[PDB]
Design a protein around this ligand. Structure first.
Ligand SMILES: *[C@H](O)[C@H](C[C@@H]1CCNC1=O)NC(=O)[C@@H]1[C@H]2CCC[C@H]2CN1C(=O)[C@@H](NC(=O)OC(C)(C)C)C(C)C
Ligand SMILES: *[C@H](O)[C@H](C[C@@H]1CCNC1=O)NC(=O)[C@@H]1[C@H]2CCC[C@H]2CN1C(=O)[C@@H](NC(=O)OC(C)(C)C)C(C)C
Ligand SMILES: [Cl-]
Ligand SMILES: [Cl-]
Ligand SMILES: [Cl-]
Ligand SMILES: [Cl-]
Ligand code: NA
Lengths: 305, 301
């Protein structure tokens, strides 16, 4: 028993992290097969960042302007190209530690593990959710760019995030590994802000199921509701709408616990309308929304990789 | 900026996890050089578990009674010995992935990462703390025994915990890697219960300093306190005493923020008295006590 915020084991990703330096800027790259991926803003000076013409800045650069280090070993850059907001550096050596992998783009509400890195060296791992406002609530300092987010399935690493920027509220923005930003953000020193966020309803329900599985049941009640009625409450409390597909995804947890999704929605309704009355759920006084239904099933059943 | 419950990257430990089977029992082992460390209860049957005589049970085992599997490879056991509550299985092949490592026994309040494993394969990694009552608040199912806790400050793995059992309140108990239990627990199916737990005061103070570093000031106040008056108040809320050692270790964070340690203690006093009144601190509506002063400096700097 027990329920913790759990990250994927990070070993398959640690073997891919390298250091990339261009000019006076150092950050991290991801070395897969014979390519290193990193944020394209590595090529900018502070003045360039105010209004970069990345196209034009890059033709100015040569292979030798990029210094790539895997541990203490330098990798020779033999080509370079840009894909959206990601720079691709072709190297002369294929990474012998390349795992089975693919590049995926995640949807808001989905979770992933972040391997925070500095100077090409992994320093910590934690679990995040892509917020509805397309930011993540990360923990990142100077030199963290190029750190990546990922999930694992059986033996396949799905890379979904590369870190680029911190917004003024202290939350974080980045791209998929094809260099497309999550959210309406740009890699430029110009005014930008996180939008108003919402709570990920289907994940709150998943966590309430995790709580019931772990013996926390005080918030259960005799009542049920309808998808229509609950979604009016959700809108009132800046919760994301709950869709029939969400209800179906939670089906396994409903059968396991005896609490239908709309039965649990009536519990959530009363928690939103009345608070927790001084009590806690799985050690929290807030409603937690960064566990997905799949996260709950995987942790409560011991899935391995 | 930002502040998260951050574990160490697990790869150096993933490369050490193996599966150990004896009889019908399977759990995890830690393969370092030519030795596999695992909980000695792997040799027990159901009938044995109430009052096992581990010395008598082990003398009856042959090396070939232990099935050790590293991924798809069976490792050959060539010797075995018991150290306290850990079994050390000597194997014919040294682990080529053995990292730089040491064994450390930790004190209550210390934090570490746990790599939860089943059948020798990793499932996930999370952060824990040794509670004042010598339990940890883990996430562990059947088959998780032999999963380990560790820190990796610098490039050296410090192994500090091996998992053995779950207590009736749903918390967890285990040993250091020399096989000595944390707390008064024993690897026997006899009635046992954790003591009343308390809150790790020095860690709450560290986390309040983290909140100030990240730009929060709403909980600060114009007051200070003596150390003894703070402890008299804090203990009424089942907080651990704050010692001069703790005041000293908070010095660097005090210096960085410009808030004297006993000034922050007066903030904590007021928070215990008032609550948060609908506010949060670093995304929490409860006072968090599983970040140490060392952890705050690691993550914020
Ligand atoms: C890459 O290592 C770095 C990561 C940052 C450093 C602090 N925490 C992080 O997450 N990224 C940057 O330094 C980026 C850089 C590319 C986009 C524009 C450049 C500045 N920047 C930032 O993250 C700053 N944020 C902003 O300037 O935000 C606005 C553009 C909205 C003003 C941050 C360092 C204040
Ligand atoms: C090893 O894989 C396993 C881990 C457990 C399983 C559920 N969650 C865990 O953390 N450990 C055990 O099964 C141990 C075993 C060795 C000590 C005695 C045996 C039972 N046990 C337990 O964890 C049980 N707990 C108790 O029996 O607790 C008392 C000894 C206090 C009665 C648990 C399975 C109920
Ligand atoms: Cl909380
Ligand atoms: Cl292995
Ligand atoms: Cl310690
Ligand atoms: Cl150390
Ligand atoms: Na109900």
């Amino acid at each position: 028993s027990g329920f913790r915020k759990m990250a994927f084991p990070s070993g398959k990703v640690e073997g891919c992290m390298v250091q990339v330096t261009c000019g006076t800027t150092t950050l991290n790259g991801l070395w897969l097969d014979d390519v290193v991926y990193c944020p394209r803003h590595v090529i900018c000076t502070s003045e360039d960042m105010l209004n970069p013409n990345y196209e034009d800045l890059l033709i100015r650069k040569s292979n030798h302007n990029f210094l790539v280090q895997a541990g203490n070993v330098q990798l020779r850059v033999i080509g370079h190209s840009m894909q959206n907001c990601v720079l691709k550096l072709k190297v002369d050596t294929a990474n012998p530690k390349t795992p089975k992998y693919k590049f995926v783009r995640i949807q808001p509400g989905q979770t992933f593990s972040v391997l925070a890195c500095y100077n090409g060296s992994p320093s910590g791992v934690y679990q995040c959710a892509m917020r509805p406002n397309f930011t993540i609530k990360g923990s990142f300092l100077n030199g963290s760019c190029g750190s990546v987010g990922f999930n694992i399935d059986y033996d396949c690493v799905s890379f979904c995030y590369m870190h680029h920027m911190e917004l003024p509220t202290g939350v974080h923005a980045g791209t998929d590994l094809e260099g497309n930003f999550y959210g309406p953000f740009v890699d430029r020193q110009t005014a930008q802000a996180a939008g108003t966020d919402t709570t990920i309803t289907v994940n709150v329900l998943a966590w309430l199921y995790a709580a019931v599985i772990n013996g926390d049941r005080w918030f259960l009640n005799r009542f049920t509701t309808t998808l229509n009625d609950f979604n009016l409450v959700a809108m009132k409390y800046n919760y994301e709408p709950l869709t029939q597909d969400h209800v179906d995804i939670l089906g396994p947890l409903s059968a396991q616990t005896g609490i239908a999704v709309l039965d649990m929605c009536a519990s959530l309704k009363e928690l939103l309308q009345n608070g927790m009355n001084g009590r806690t759920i799985l050690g929290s006084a807030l409603l937690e929304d960064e566990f997905t239904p799949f996260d709950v099933v995987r942790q409560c059943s011991g899935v391995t990789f």
